[PDB]
């Protein structure tokens, strides 16, 4: 009897979805700031 | 090689097909006598 790697998501339990919640927090916020930065960049390159 | 393979694999079929129609001749008595002799030898060597 043994375990594996990356199974806390495969089980699909409570942690398997809280993990998605956490990752999505982080990367939605990062995508927001990155979109703002890319805007800023193009709107500066207008000059 | 290829030509020789074709040649021999056709020779075998041609001659065997000739033989399977050549056996239809009237050599029956020779075969029967030979087989009875074979019976003689087998019976002798079977005990």
């Amino acid at each position: 009897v043994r375990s594996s790697a990356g199974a806390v998501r495969d089980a699909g339990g409570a942690f398997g979805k809280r993990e998605q919640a956490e990752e999505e927090r982080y990367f939605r916020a990062r995508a927001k700031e990155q979109l703002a930065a890319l805007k800023k960049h193009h709107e500066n390159e207008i000059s | 090689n290829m030509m020789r393979q074709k040649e021999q694999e056709h020779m075998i079929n041609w001659v065997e097909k000739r033989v399977v129609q050549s056996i239809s001749a009237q050599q029956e008595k020779e075969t029967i006598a030979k087989c009875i002799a074979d019976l003689k030898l087998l019976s002798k060597k079977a005990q």
């Binding site: - | 065997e16 399977v20 056996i23 074979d38 003689k40 079977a46």
Partner: protein, 92 residues
């Protein structure tokens, strides 16, 4: 419902009791009866001391030549057909 199976078996049980070994000679084609005489007189050379021969001839043109002889179990095949396939096998 299977009484005929019983008696038939019993016959096979009595035949061997009196010692009449089954035989059979499948021939390339029609056969003479003098040839059958020599055949019986030579097959009697296979029995033990006392047994009897019960030869059931059968004509067979499906084979090519020679003959197939069954005696009890012992099976000797000298039909030209098997010789032809044996030779083709060997030289293939």
């Amino acid at each position: 419902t299977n009484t005929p199976a019983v008696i038939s078996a019993f016959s096979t049980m009595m035949s061997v009791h009196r010692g009449e070994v089954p035989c059979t000679v499948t021939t390339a084609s029609a056969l003479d009866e003098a040839t059958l005489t020599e055949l019986k007189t030579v097959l009697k050379s296979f029995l033990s001391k006392g047994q009897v021969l019960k030869l059931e001839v059968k004509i067979d043109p499906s084979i090519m030549g020679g003959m197939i002889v069954r005696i009890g179990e012992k099976y000797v095949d000298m039909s030209a057909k098997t010789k032809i396939q044996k030779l083709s096998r060997a030289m293939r």
